[PDB]
A paper describes a structure:
In order to provide 3D templates for understanding [name] and its many roles in immune evasion, replication and assembly, we crystallized [name] from Sudan virus (two versions crystallized: SUDV1–233 and SUDV11–233) and Reston virus (one version crystallized: RESTV11–237). We subsequently determined structures of SUDV1–233 and RESTV11–237 by molecular replacement, both at 2.0 Å resolution. Crystal structures presented here include [name] from an ebolavirus that is pathogenic to humans (Sudan virus; SUDV) and [name] from an ebolavirus that thus far, appears nonpathogenic to humans (Reston virus; RESTV), although it is lethal to nonhuman primates. The overall folds of SUDV and RESTV [name] are similar, as expected (r.m.s.d. of 0.81 Å; also see Figure S2b for structural alignment). The entrance to the hydrophobic cavity (11 Å wide) appears to be gated by two residues (Y172 and M71) that point away from each other in RESTV [name] but toward each other in SUDV [name], appearing to block the hydrophobic cavity. Crystal packing can sometimes illustrate biologically relevant assemblies, but no tetrameric or other higher oligomeric interactions are observed in crystals of SUDV or RESTV [name]. One pairwise [name]-[name] interaction is conserved in the crystal packing between the SUDV (P3121) and RESTV [name] (P1211) structures, although it is currently unclear if it is biologically relevant. This interaction involves α1, β1–3 and the N-terminal region of α8, and buries residue L147 that was previously implicated for virulence, although 142–146 remain solvent exposed. Another crystal lattice interaction observed in both RESTV and SUDV structures involves packing of the hydrophobic N-terminal regions of [name] into the Face 3 pocket of a neighboring molecule.
[name], one of only eight proteins encoded by ebolaviruses, functions in virus replication and assembly, and is thought to contribute to immune suppression by binding to a certain class of molecules called karyopherins to prevent them from transporting a transcription factor termed [name]. In addition to its role in interferon antagonism, ebolavirus [name] has also been proposed to associate with membranes, and is important for assembly and function of the viral ribonucleoprotein complex (RNP), where [name] binds to the viral nucleoprotein NP. [name] adopts a compact, single domain, α/β structure of novel fold (DaliLite v.3). The overall shape of [name] resembles a triangular pyramid of dimensions 73 Å×30 Å×30 Å.
Author numbering: 9 to 106, 113 to 232
The structure:
């Protein structure tokens, strides 16, 4: 034996911080706390995305509607909560640079991204055995790095400066675009079937106001 393990506390804390997605209401909107990271989410942008979807006549929004027709002119797109937008971004932060942790990490990301449950029921006892300060630290570091990358994006522009990132996996495609309001977040099927003009596939999307990630960037 090289080092005596004393891991109960460690595993208890990692389990708590990784497997509980904490949301509480605040005056502005909601505070979210996950993996020891704190985010203030507000309502800004939601009503705009909703109005934007309606097939009414509005020349002022013609360009935006025509820029993202798969979001704004599509009966199968659905606006989600800003909480959802944050969950997608956290998952993307895990997947972005994604050896034994991989499995577990993926699980956590899939939980964040494909469900709205606040507790993550571990699939197997072995994956649960994976929970550690090291896994938590890796996850936080990944998320911070991805937030920093996001903060380098330019708003949609006419000059060819990067304005979006895309994360692909076999189960889904994530696209995150910097707009004047914040991060436009979308999840489409892996083949990106929402992008097909003749029959636009289903797509979930929302907006995370730019106030939310700023303070967590380093």
């Amino acid at each position: 034996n090289l080092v005596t393990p004393k891991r109960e506390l460690e595993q208890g804390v990692a389990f708590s911080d990784l497997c509980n997605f904490l949301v509480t209401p605040t005056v502005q909107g909601w505070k979210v706390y996950w993996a020891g990271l704190e985010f203030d989410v507000n309502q800004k942008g939601i009503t705009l995305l909703n109005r934007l979807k309606v097939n009414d006549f509005a020349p002022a929004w013609a360009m935006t509607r025509n820029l993202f027709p798969h979001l704004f002119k599509n009966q199968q797109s659905e606006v989600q909560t800003p909480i959802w937008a944050l969950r997608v971004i956290l998952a993307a932060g895990i997947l972005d640079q994604l050896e034994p942790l991989s499995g577990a990490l993926n699980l956590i990301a899939d939980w964040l991204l494909t469900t709205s449950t606040n507790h993550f029921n571990m699939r197997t006892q072995r994956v649960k055995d994976q929970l550690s300060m090291r896994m938590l630290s890796l996850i936080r570091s990944n998320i911070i790095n991805f937030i920093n990358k996001l903060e380098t994006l330019h708003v949609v522009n006419y000059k060819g400066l990067l304005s979006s990132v895309e994360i692909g996996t076999p189960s889904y495609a994530i696209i995150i675009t910097r707009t004047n309001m914040g991060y436009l977040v979308e999840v489409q099927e892996p083949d990106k079937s929402a992008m097909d003009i003749r029959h636009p596939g289903p797509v979930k999307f929302s907006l995370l106001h730019e106030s939310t990630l700023k303070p967590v960037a380093t």
